[PDB]
Amino acid sequence: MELTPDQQTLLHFIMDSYNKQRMPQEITNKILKEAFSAEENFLILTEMATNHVQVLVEFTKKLPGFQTLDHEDQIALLKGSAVEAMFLRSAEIFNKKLPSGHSDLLEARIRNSGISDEYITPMFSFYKSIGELKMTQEEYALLTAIVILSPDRQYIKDREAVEKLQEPLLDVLQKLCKIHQPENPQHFACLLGRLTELRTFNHHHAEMLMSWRVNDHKFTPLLCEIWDVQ
């Protein structure tokens, strides 16, 4: 039922590594402060995404057993999860409670950032689906670790080694779901199901960025490695 001492240790360790990311308030304060042009917002996105990948690699390296995996499998897991982790972190930030009217202005500002309408609808639909789960910071952190340690990624040579690292995180998350929402026994399955919806952002991420309403789509060398661009 309850978390074991080893599970508690693992949870706080994951939380500590997860909290090293750029603060949600920092991000929403900039978007809410003033409106930017589609060109300015595109540059804000590439800098945000570059910093996100850098911190994501540091978070990934701290996941227990990650460093014992095959080097080519390590690359495949990072490359296979970076885009999903960015959208999951964006969903977390979007769902943080703000003063009255602020989330509406934040949504409207993102909606007019330069991204095409056809990508707007699936994006905000995912954010609001995530918002309905009323996830805790611990649930976001564990779900991010579970996304990264997905044994089903393309080019993974040793799936069983990845499974062994993901399974204890799924067990911890399942216990947290039973504790945070005892009235909702579907909560864990819901959380896992939203991970399937998360995977849809991979197929169209390159088009989402290339169709941004700007004349030049400049990306950093690191983003070029992780995103299918340039």
Partner: peptide
């Protein structure tokens, strides 16, 4: 090489 910067960030420290 493919994913040269990622391989670097993974193998450093």
């Amino acid at each position: 090489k493919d994913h040269q910067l990622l391989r670097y960030l993974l193998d450093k420290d």
